[PDB]
């Protein structure tokens, strides 16, 4: 378990794409170019995020996290684990 922390002051996507598999979990399905994660280097495509800002995304609607992440302001704390690079 790794606790990454990155501050976000601007209203824009972090810089990664994740989905909820049949098991229901947010994992970066693919890293986007230009994002803060791809530029700064906080996560990697495939990394498993057990928790997103204190909330574990499930098969349900993600709009809850998508909005919260877009409306969030400050240091974001995500629980991710390296799936062997």
């Amino acid at each position: 378990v790794r606790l990454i922390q990155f501050e976000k002051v601007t209203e824009e996507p972090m810089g990664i794409c994740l989905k909820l598999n049949e098991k229901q979990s947010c994992t970066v399905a693919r890293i986007l170019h230009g994002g803060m994660i791809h530029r700064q280097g906080s996560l990697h495509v495939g990394d498993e995020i057990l928790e997103i800002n204190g909330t574990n995304v499930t098969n349900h609607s993600v709009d809850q996290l998508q909005k919260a992440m877009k409306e969030t302001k400050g240091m974001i704390s995500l629980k991710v684990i390296p799936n062997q690079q």
């Binding site: 996507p13 972090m14 996290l65 998508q66």
Partner: peptide
Amino acid sequence: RKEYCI
């Protein structure tokens, strides 16, 4: 399958 960019 779906994918979210955030």
